[PDB]
Amino acid sequence: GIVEQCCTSICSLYQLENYCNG
Amino acid sequence: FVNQHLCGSHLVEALYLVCGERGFFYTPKTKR
């Protein structure tokens, strides 16, 4: 999940908002 | 979009800035 998505590939603020509360 | 990589506490700090005022999940998987 979250910890691989920006470590193994690229991320932006719009991808960090995928891991926010909800 | 931006070509940046983040791992460990650097990825937690970016998620803290984007979500730390709403809450977030940093665990490798959860019930979501």
CA distance B32 to A9: 21
Which residues in chain B have Cβ-Cβ distances shorter than 8 Å to A3?
Answer: 7, 11, 26, 28
Whole-number Å distance between alpha carbons of B9 and B32: 22
Give the separation between CA B32 and CA A12, rounded to whole angstroms: 20
C-alpha B32/C-alpha B17 separation (Å) is: 21
Angstrom distance (rounded) from CA A1 to CA A7: 11
Q: At B19, phi and psi to the nearest 5? A: -135, -10
Q: Of A19, A14, A13, nearest to A4 (Cα)?
A: A19
Q: CA A9, CA B9: separation in Å to the nearest integer?
A: 16
For residue B29, what is the nearest residue in chain A, using CA coordinates?
A: A1
Q: How was this structure determined?
A: NMR
Question: Residue for token digits 């991320």?
Answer: A11
